[PDB]
Write an enzyme that holds these catalytic residues in place. Sequence first.
Site, PDB file in Angstrom:
ATOM      1  N   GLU A   1       0.813  -1.219   0.000  1.00 23.45           N
ATOM      2  CA  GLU A   1       0.000   0.000   0.000  1.00 23.45           C
ATOM      3  C   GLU A   1       0.845   1.267   0.000  1.00 23.45           C
ATOM      4  O   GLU A   1       0.836   2.044   0.964  1.00 23.45           O
ATOM      5  CB  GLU A   1      -0.992  -0.020   1.169  1.00 23.45           C
ATOM      6  CG  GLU A   1      -1.825  -1.302   1.230  1.00 23.45           C
ATOM      7  CD  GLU A   1      -2.850  -1.283   2.340  1.00 23.45           C
ATOM      8  OE1 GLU A   1      -2.461  -1.404   3.519  1.00 23.45           O
ATOM      9  OE2 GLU A   1      -4.048  -1.154   2.030  1.00 23.45           O
TER      10      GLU A   1
ATOM     11  N   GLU B   1      -3.644 -10.548   0.260  1.00 23.34           N
ATOM     12  CA  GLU B   1      -4.574 -10.458   1.391  1.00 23.34           C
ATOM     13  C   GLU B   1      -5.954 -10.825   0.908  1.00 23.34           C
ATOM     14  O   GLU B   1      -6.404 -10.319  -0.128  1.00 23.34           O
ATOM     15  CB  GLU B   1      -4.624  -9.041   1.988  1.00 23.34           C
ATOM     16  CG  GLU B   1      -3.379  -8.617   2.735  1.00 23.34           C
ATOM     17  CD  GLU B   1      -3.309  -7.121   3.007  1.00 23.34           C
ATOM     18  OE1 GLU B   1      -4.359  -6.506   3.318  1.00 23.34           O
ATOM     19  OE2 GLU B   1      -2.190  -6.567   2.918  1.00 23.34           O
TER      20      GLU B   1
HETATM   21  C1  LIG Z   1     -10.042   0.917   2.962  1.00 23.46           C
HETATM   22  C2  LIG Z   1      -9.334   0.522   4.260  1.00 23.46           C
HETATM   23  C3  LIG Z   1     -10.261  -0.271   5.182  1.00 23.46           C
HETATM   24  S1  LIG Z   1      -7.834  -0.340   3.864  1.00 23.46           S
HETATM   25  C4  LIG Z   1      -7.704  -2.009   4.432  1.00 23.46           C
HETATM   26  O1  LIG Z   1      -7.815  -2.018   5.850  1.00 23.46           O
HETATM   27  C5  LIG Z   1      -7.716  -3.303   6.448  1.00 23.46           C
HETATM   28  C6  LIG Z   1      -8.173  -3.150   7.901  1.00 23.46           C
HETATM   29  O2  LIG Z   1      -7.717  -4.233   8.726  1.00 23.46           O
HETATM   30  C7  LIG Z   1      -6.290  -3.821   6.239  1.00 23.46           C
HETATM   31  O3  LIG Z   1      -5.333  -2.973   6.876  1.00 23.46           O
HETATM   32  C8  LIG Z   1      -5.984  -3.860   4.739  1.00 23.46           C
HETATM   33  O4  LIG Z   1      -4.600  -4.136   4.500  1.00 23.46           O
HETATM   34  C9  LIG Z   1      -6.327  -2.549   4.039  1.00 23.46           C
HETATM   35  O5  LIG Z   1      -6.266  -2.777   2.634  1.00 23.46           O
END
Ligand SMILES: CC(C)S[C@@H]1O[C@H](CO)[C@H](O)[C@H](O)[C@H]1O
EC number: 3.2.1.23
Lengths: 1015, 211, 174
Positions: free
Chosen positions: B69, B145
């Site tokens: 990210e 993920e």
């Molecule tokens: C648009 C956001 C919620 S980003 C989203 O948040 C998640 C929350 O646990 C993780 O951190 C993921 O890596 C992230 O892509």
Amino acid sequence: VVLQRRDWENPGVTQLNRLAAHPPFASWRNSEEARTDRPSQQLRSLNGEWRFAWFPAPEAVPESWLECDLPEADTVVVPSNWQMHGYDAPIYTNVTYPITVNPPFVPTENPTGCYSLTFNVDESWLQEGQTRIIFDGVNSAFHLWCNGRWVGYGQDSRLPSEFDLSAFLRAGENRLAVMVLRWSDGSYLEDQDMWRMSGIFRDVSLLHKPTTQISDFHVATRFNDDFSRAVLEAEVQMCGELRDYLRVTVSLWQGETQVASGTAPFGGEIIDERGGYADRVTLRLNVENPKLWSAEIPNLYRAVVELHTADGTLIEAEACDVGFREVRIENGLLLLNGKPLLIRGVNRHEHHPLHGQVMDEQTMVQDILLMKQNNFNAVRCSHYPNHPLWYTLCDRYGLYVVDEANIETHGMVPMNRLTDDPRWLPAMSERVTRMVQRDRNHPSVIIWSLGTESGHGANHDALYRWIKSVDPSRPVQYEGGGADTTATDIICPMYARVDEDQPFPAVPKWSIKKWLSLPGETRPLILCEYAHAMGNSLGGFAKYWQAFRQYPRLQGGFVWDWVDQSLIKYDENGNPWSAYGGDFGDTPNDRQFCMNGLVFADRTPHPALTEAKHQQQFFQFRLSGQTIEVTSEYLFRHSDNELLHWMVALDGKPLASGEVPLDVAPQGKQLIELPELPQPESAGQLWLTVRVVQPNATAWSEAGHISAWQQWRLAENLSVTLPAASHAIPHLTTSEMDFCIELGNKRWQFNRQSGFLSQMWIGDKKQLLTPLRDQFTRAPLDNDIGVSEATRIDPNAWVERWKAAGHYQAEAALLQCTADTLADAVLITTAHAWQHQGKTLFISRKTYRIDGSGQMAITVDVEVASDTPHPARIGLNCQLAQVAERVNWLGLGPQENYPDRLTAACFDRWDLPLSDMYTPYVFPSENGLRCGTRELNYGPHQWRGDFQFNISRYSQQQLMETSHRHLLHAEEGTWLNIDGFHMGIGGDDSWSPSVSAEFQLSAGRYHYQLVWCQK
Amino acid sequence: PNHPLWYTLCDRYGLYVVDEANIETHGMVPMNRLTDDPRWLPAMSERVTRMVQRDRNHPSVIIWSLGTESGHGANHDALYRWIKSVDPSRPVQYEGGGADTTATDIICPMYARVDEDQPFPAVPKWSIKKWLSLPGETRPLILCEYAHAMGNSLGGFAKYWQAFRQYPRLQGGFVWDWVDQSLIKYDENGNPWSAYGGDFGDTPNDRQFCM
Amino acid sequence: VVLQRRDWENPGVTQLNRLAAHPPFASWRNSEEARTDRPSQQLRSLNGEWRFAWFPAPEAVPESWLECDLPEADTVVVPSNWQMHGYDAPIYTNVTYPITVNPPFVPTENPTGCYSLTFNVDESWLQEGQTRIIFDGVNSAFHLWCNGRWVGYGQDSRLPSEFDLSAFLRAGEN
Ligand SMILES: CC(C)S[C@@H]1O[C@H](CO)[C@H](O)[C@H](O)[C@H]1O
Ligand SMILES: CC(C)S[C@@H]1O[C@H](CO)[C@H](O)[C@H](O)[C@H]1O
Ligand SMILES: [Mg+2]
Ligand SMILES: [Mg+2]
Ligand SMILES: [Mg+2]
Ligand code: NA
Ligand code: NA
Ligand code: NA
Ligand code: NA
Ligand code: NA
């Protein structure tokens, strides 16, 4: 804290508080001034009289210098190199670093230039916006102070360092203090084969920008398949406060006509999950039937980039020249605007014999004109980004440029020790990135280079990808580590030969023809360096161009190099002389290796230049019967400024001539039918000469400029007539020591102990100062010497082969010397054996026939031992008593020419002052030869036959014993060397034997003949 | 990069490891503002180079990652190529800027669904079955993920695995994630309780999203 | 020098005098121990009880601390996060930066951890060879001093920073 940190010994620190790089800014506040590129009130020069002090180290600088001018300091001009003012010595070293290789450390004795300037700043600049200072060139690192307070630090000698001074200045007087370090960790990346100098050597300026400003902009031009439509795409970035009412207008101008325009608010397209650049805007302008840019026709448009309010109130304008052109590699060819290029290129260091490495407009313009007049269309910025005016001029006059990052680590062992080290990646990235950010809008720049001679390291690969990532409009090339690695789009070897493989381990330099077709290979080949023009050189240059023409994928190369790096020194009287490595006390040094120019330091041509112009011609010629076929090698332009002058001569006597306009399309053909040629009833060879003349002046040439020429033998009529027999018959006068021949006022003498013509008399006066003897040697050329030195012999160089075989000190031994009175002549037979330590090197068998008309027919037959190294020449020499004003000859000329460098010479009747028959090479050697000569005239003397000759006031012996041109003294009389055969000069490189097999004197048995008479 | 012992254990017990550089610039606007800026290349490169120089002998490491990210910037490209240059033994993957940029050997989206397209501008998360066959695409797809296991979750987990099995080029993914990042606080009586965002005075916070 | 430089607000300074990175080393002097991966006498753990004080900014750190233990400082276990010892608060944020987004600058209120250790060095390590200190993880940047003299500086919370202490060490207490 500054002395404490030693940032100049930390490759992790390459700048402190330095602003981002960007394309040339002027911050115009009037859009019209931007369009016309007039001077801008917002960009002030700080060039001129500065205060300078020298110190042996940065620790030796007194703390008062930040607050007060130093009284012991002087007033010097800026820009300048401090070696050029005599503060210390410049060092010339090629490969070996000028300092001890202990990265990242430099010597504690680090020459330190303290520069200062008291200058004025207007009120207006300090109430609004941003005042920055720009140092275009500082060698090699520096700290900056303003009014006593520290601003920042910078490295990279060859790119602008810019600092925000807004918070440091006051209205009225202000003082800059600049501490410039000669050596820093940057020096490890600046091991270019050139003079090692230092100081503020480029322009310094102040630029005022608004608070809300254009901080960057990129211009791209993309085309449809047939180039009838383009899209100009301009990306603009601002700094300052982001507001709704903000707009950019990119408008495109051809002269006074606006051809296209676009206007948008800020906020580019969505880029990722967090949005887009609210501080960016992309403008796209449609352009129908664009005028395309090339080196042949450098069509330019003007892009004006306006930052303004919705309502139309200008904030500032920047601008640049746009050349509409595509550069792409397709199917293994480099294409410009869809056509395959033939690079007629040269390497060009920034060098001036007086000002060192400071560049000025006049010199740059002078260089460009000479380049174009001599048929170059390309330049490599060896080996660093240039003065910014250079690209502008290249855009405008039209040259293709290779922009090269300031990275050379040649002296490292192995060459990639830094470039493979991830720790030197940061310092390397900045030298590549800051170049692209600065120069990416210049159409003249067609190829990016990652530097030179740094081996091949992982860092090169990263930076290759970076450039390909940010700029898909240009190929990336890089020669290091074998010239065809994964960090280059173009096979770009240096000094790879035409037909001859040099299969070095790991980094072979293949025959360039062989290289293209190695298994799996598909890339184009353009030599980053070839044809080392050191001294009497450029032998075999035609072989390259023959190959370039025949092989579509061999797309040319860049000659090494443009201008000798000689520097002016003065003697006791006060007269200037040209100096090379080791002449400033500098040691260790690589002597005359800094002089590889097609031109002298003062921009006077070497003879090789003309050979380059001829081989780099743009019109090709074939003759069938009475038809000349003209083919154009231009890709875009018609021959709309060209006529053909033809000329037919009989042994130099003109019989007919004419003119036909040239009307040939790019890559096209024109047939010219010559009128009935008048068959001459007289013995001789008819020669046809054509010259392409440009009748109108250009930006780069005068009216009557000759751009191309060629010759052909037409019909020959061999002489069948016997000379009218004479009444008189010469008288033989035998003695113990001498054979004397008498005829009228003329008298010949053969010394019976030496076996040679010791003297000739016309009437009373002596004609020889030294007897006529065979010569098998020459004053060694730079190519004959290579890297051989007095204290480190290279037994492979031609000179050392010659020395070790005894060629230079062989003694003539008389085997035979008889006289015979014939019916209408006297015949003298001789035989010599040249020996060294019991080995017979050469044998010369001669007859001299002196007849009743006073002509002496000399017949020479030489045996050369198959196992002795092939000799430099097979001829005769003597020192004539006569010193005449003029030399007149029927042969190739008018300039100096050798067997492997004679294509540019034309067969005709030439007449030059004796001084033109000497070539003033800074390192003296054999020079001034003219080949294919049928008749030579000097005073009352005339020689006839088929020979090569040089003629001068300097013996081969003085040329070989003297190190500099200015230390030569004119000897009594004139040294005449007449060769039946002379070895090539070579120059494919200047550090191994480079003379091609077919130009070596290897036949073992050689025959020549000369008639000598008074006229 | 993890604590050095982790790699040793994975070597010996047997787990495939994606080793990931310490680069995340999620809060930038737009996400690549740093990673496209050449002035940040030095800092970024040391985070990638010093990882590879350390972990390159661990067999458990099978894929290098350029981080997470941080959008897609030219710095990713240089660093991608750096790794490919020094270590041709391992693929390089990176999700930023659309999951299928030129800085990745593997289509590695996060939270791309099985059958449902989510056509966001510039950075769409295509259905993974669909993603595989986009014009000109040839790469394998492994989600970096997926299956956000937040609270009562993992609904539709079986749908991923059925697709993973049916499609040779859908080669799995990494669940988000292993362990709740709740911290232990103690009350008035000294009895342990699970704490998330906001429970340490911390503000602005993202509440239970750490679990 | 150290406080005027502000190396922690400069993306061009990510380390000072850091040794080159490399695969895990133990410098065994016995080939059998290397084969079996048993402990090495040449690699010493400095994990255990250190001394620690918290500060609101690096400007607030007294110069005495380079020369002597701060009497008010506490004895804590290392490795640890000082939020787990309760000196300030751990912050949970997902996307939004925990600080004002203004690169390269950080808040003036910048919690500073002051860690110190008194330790002995084996006789022989001082006469011959190279002695380096390895910090496997330090969050987020740090300056290092040995016996009052400055050694170096490090960034990247998640990889080892290494420094040559060969010229800094003395017999007895360091
Ligand atoms: C648009 C956001 C919620 S980003 C989203 O948040 C998640 C929350 O646990 C993780 O951190 C993921 O890596 C992230 O892509
Ligand atoms: C092996 C060495 C001669 S290298 C040689 O030196 C030349 C001298 O002019 C040029 O500088 C070339 O660039 C370099 O390749
Ligand atoms: Mg430095
Ligand atoms: Mg070199
Ligand atoms: Mg920093
Ligand atoms: Na060609
Ligand atoms: Na040279
Ligand atoms: Na000489
Ligand atoms: Na599968
Ligand atoms: Na989370």
